[model samples]
Target: HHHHHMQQIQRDIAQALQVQPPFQSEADVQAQIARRIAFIQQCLKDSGLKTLVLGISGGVDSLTAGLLAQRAVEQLREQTGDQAYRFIAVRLPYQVQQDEADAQASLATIRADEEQTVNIGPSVKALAEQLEALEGLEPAKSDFVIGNIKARIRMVAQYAIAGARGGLVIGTDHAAEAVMGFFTKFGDGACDLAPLSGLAKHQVRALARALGAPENLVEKHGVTYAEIDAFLHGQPLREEAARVIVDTYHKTQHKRELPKAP
Candidate 1:
């Protein structure tokens, strides 16, 4: 029975990568993009809000979301005749982000109405220190633990901006991230809306191209995302690579679910 369930999950992941049944063609993809932009606009209209806040990570996923948000604000202005609609792109760094050039490229591509940089290094360092002092132990050395701290701290920064601007927080999660549980729980995972949740990584690249995003942002991370998709699609892959993606999927399933009740 457990084996059957595992097979079922793999099948679902493969189905998501197809993206055609849910999206008929490139034109269909265009239509879906329109719908998502309108969805964002309507959410603001219904909620009496004026801004959309997104963390621009210089990564493909965030770039995709940020560009869509820029369009949403533009369309909202034309539709409502209200020039108050804004897209706020935030740069949240642990310290000095080494790849800030890529992030700046994304911001230029998105042409966000407003941009802000909020460094979370001090906050993460202080919190880790406090936890260690409370436990009377050395600070954690695991990159995994520190990575989670970074993600959650970025979430705090994004939400702080959202609260101050009376805006919605946009998330970059998509089918690939969702199936693999690749997001930090209550961190990047916590967002008011996820416009790209229905797309796979490759599909996202397609949309990114459609949106005229920077080529580097669309292709820089494609190799890894492609390998994962290849494994899910039953394409040939290195045994080691296949094992890693599959194992991570199973291990991280809890991140994709709500709290369990007995």
Candidate 2:
């Protein structure tokens, strides 16, 4: 599994994600939360922006970011006495997501200042059909491309809202997803700002709990967040766990990089 040195690859990712920070005070968790919230506020304030926008997909990642954003805008308003500041939580479903109830639950928990639902099904379906109409395209396998199209369209929808409201578009990517390259490039991966980057999945869960919401959202990933978290934290991982982590990292590497330059 050597591609210009695998260990070096891990080292670079580790540095970029800030995974090497050894922290455990629990109270420090609360303090870190304040810092990150302050980070969001500073970014919005510096830009003279009025709102923060993010999609809540009923997943722990977005849910956590939503809570942080809602708190950030509220705190900013209190500090600056600007009642116009707000957090707009968007719902971008592909027609009807099967986990609508979970999404609703997250929305209720988040309680953002503004909520909007932009159904992306029509646009995605129309464009997907156009691509599928191409002569050499395969039948069902285009689902992969279709999925990419869906993510990019969702980003477009969020940007549209942010543009309308003069808000900054926030993102929901953390260290685990970054190391594994789980987010699509310029798709769901695109955003004006990422407040929750460089955090492992378990760290996000811990932060979510500290922030007053909860979930064990690790089941979906074949390799548990425990394994992924451990690996990112520089712990010994099981053979299979390490294999998948490294391989997936290498395979999806492009998603984490800038467009190749000459």
Candidate 3:
């Protein structure tokens, strides 16, 4: 009931704003996002959870979260000398041709404070090879399992890195995904901290842009307001699909939800 009421409130807000609830005016959304960051930083400082370790897949959500984490850590340092703020972005890619490039681009564009790349191909392959021997399993079958593996492997890597760094794993979830429960349980959702969980896809993009983040970060990864229109079965959905999900989250009263187009 509470969840449904929130969605209804979101729909009403969207109607009043004459846009959408999730993707409000860029400036307004960015201001709210910045405020959230400030709040998170203050809470982390008080709780001694200042360090942040995150996964970066060269995707928009990860990229945006990494950037925000970086900004927050920097602010913590500038404000307080004893603030032990740190940001680590880890790239855990599976055996895919574009994985290396994606990981590299993410690290480079965001300039993540401490970056590491761990190849999950070997582990995933080992597990799959073992499973293949089972009666119901096939050899290296590629399906949604591939994506889920990527997500879970990256999550584990992030937590491990966080432990080594004495930090917490920063989640990359956005509002739309949270409403849909899109993450793999105990995978993407298993994080020590989620600084951007309340944000929508488009809103996060706006915050990234407002933060003076790298251009390629937005062009290659981020979503914008106009992009939402194209995703409802119009054209190629780069940022548009993400935009639609956020819009849908606001327009529809559903609370309780991908990496790429298949």
Candidate 4:
């Protein structure tokens, strides 16, 4: 058996990524909520800010984060008796999101104190068009590059509010995405503080269910969050899947951190 080999492998990755497995039970989930709320409270006090801002993508990740943000501000207002504590959930779509119903569902569930929308299509197209106008510039109007532009612009929209209102922007990234570096740098990856840092994909859903909120890729990655989470939880993955996970983990290291020092 490769038991020993797998143990060491999990140990190495757990150390490098600073990830922990999902909660063992609903009690653990409750405890996690309390702790994360406390963390959010501390961030506000430390920054002297009273508002929390997040972009609602209609996915469970943002839904979970939005719930936590709402709870954090609610509790903050109660504890401090400050009516100013609030959470603002913004809808940043590329013109119009195809999944409008789902986003509405999540927003209704999260029940944030404030809701706003900032369509990013014009800004995203402007940069693409400007780049295309240049004769010698690289690729222009690329679908993938434009997607990245949308992500980065989403942050800009949230940060614009945070900057003007003395608030902090929240991010939805957790361990599963981080392990794969599946976010645009300073884009969706950008935030003042991420409340879901150490959680795996299942852990995110678990938190969602714990809060009473509500799956995946396959043809693309040979493996999905299921195997990735198993590996993250110190459980051995099939070697075929493990290799892909490990390879991507290694290749994406540059995305996870700052510019390398000279």
Candidate 5:
């Protein structure tokens, strides 16, 4: 009952603000999404961000954010001039087995004006080696500790490039991840502009399709490349993803288990 009431209050607030429901029919949602992109573009019009730097992970959220950033830059250019904005794409590879094809696709689809690919493993190795060389410092565990190190290092590299280029950092965070705390706070979760913050995963996919994003990208999931075919063969992709809606809602509404903050 409390949950339902809270949702009702949210709807009432939306009505009051005259901000249309975040998700309505397909077209409505798409238009609202475009509006958000436009807002971001406008906000950065004179911020001296040389280019928009996006980490296109080949995942839906990152891909959608990249595409939106592309459109926003183009729109800004149209209003301003071609020289006003440019886009950069960066890819961070962890293990030797990172999906090169997917990473390439991500950068290509964005049509990034600049591209940089860095192997994160070397940085992780250097850190571990330095620690091992210390008198009493124990080496960190290889997988989880190194994984987080890689994520933070990638952020450092991306932000450094953004700083040098005077470009804004475009992020791929969404409502699902935000409410669930499914992302690392300072790493992979920091950004100067987040176009997808209001969207859930399903809504992001819909918005991406509405914008006519590449079909292959719209189909990818968090699965191994070798398992992609087998994964799709066993079930309808949309049907499989439908399960996330309930999960997303539950997490959004109750997972934190705390009263609203003051």
Candidate 6:
């Protein structure tokens, strides 16, 4: 029964994310990228907007999304002769992020029309302090707990900038994040557009390679996206990797949807 259930879950996740087999091939991946570029451009045109805002985290997914956004804006400008269309890559660090250099490298590769840096640490600290004081709740001790706060704070920063610039927020959510529900509900999960939502993490790396992103950026570690993809695709992975991915997906199911109504 457990095996059956896991099989069901894998199939459901794949179907929900609209994962097509053709996306596995590099040529097909580039074709999909071209389609998404056009879709983004049309969305902007339909909404009468000129700017697309994205948080550049220097991770493979974010780098891929940022590159797509930059190219989309460039193509839009060329097609419409509207030079004002812009891609704004925001560097959102919780504090002095240790991997800040990686983020800089991604930004150089993306070459967004504008770049902004907003430190979210102060806001997260202030809110966490106030919450602890008011409720007498224990300070968030776990990295998981505090990390969610940082993610939400980054969302606030991104939205604030997008609101001011009349830009659409681009999210890097992809198939692996979708299945694992590995994003904060209104944090990194919140976005006006998700161009990579249908691609698996491996597929995203393929697109990143096609986009000429730095090789190191495409292969950066420290996230479970790649591991989960390996598990899903039957590639070699750690013995416990499949268990972790399945458990996380089940536990975080509620994060994927709206609040239930009676």
Q: Which stretches of candidate 1 lie over 4 Å from their true place?
A: 1-7, 13-24, 94-98, 133-141, 221-223, 231-246
TM-score-superior candidate, 1 or 2: 2
Candidate that would win on TM-score: 4
TM-score of each: 0.84, 0.89, 0.69, 0.90, 0.71, 0.87
What Cα-based lDDT does every candidate model obtain? 0.79, 0.82, 0.64, 0.82, 0.64, 0.81
Q: Runs in model 4 with CA error above 4 Å?
A: 1-6, 95-98, 133-141, 214-220
On a 0 to 100 scale, what is the lDDT of residue 169 in model 4? 92
Instruction: For candidate 6, write residues 75-181 as lDDT tens digits.
Output: 88888898889999999864446468888889999988999999887888788776653354446545567778899889989989989998999988887778778
> Comparing 2 and 5 by TM-score, which wins?
2
Ranking by lDDT: 4, 2, 6, 1, 5, 3
For residue 114, model 5's alpha carbon misses the true position, in angstroms, by 2.0
Better of 4 and 5 by TM-score: 4
Please give the ranking of all candidate structures by TM-score, highest first, separated by commas: 4, 2, 6, 1, 5, 3
Shift in Å, residue 248, candidate 4: 0.7
Q: How well is each residue in 1-262 modelled by candidate 5, as lDDT tens digits?
A: 9656644644442232232233657678767776878867865765856588877676888878887877887777777776758777888764334456676776777786667876677777788677653445345545556567677787888888889888888877765455434665467877787777655456677777776777777776232322222211222334334334334434555322344676
In candidate 2, how many Å is residue 30 off? 0.7
After superposition, the stretches of candidate 5 with alpha carbons farther than 4 Å from their true spots are 1-22, 82-84, 96-98, 132-142, 221-262
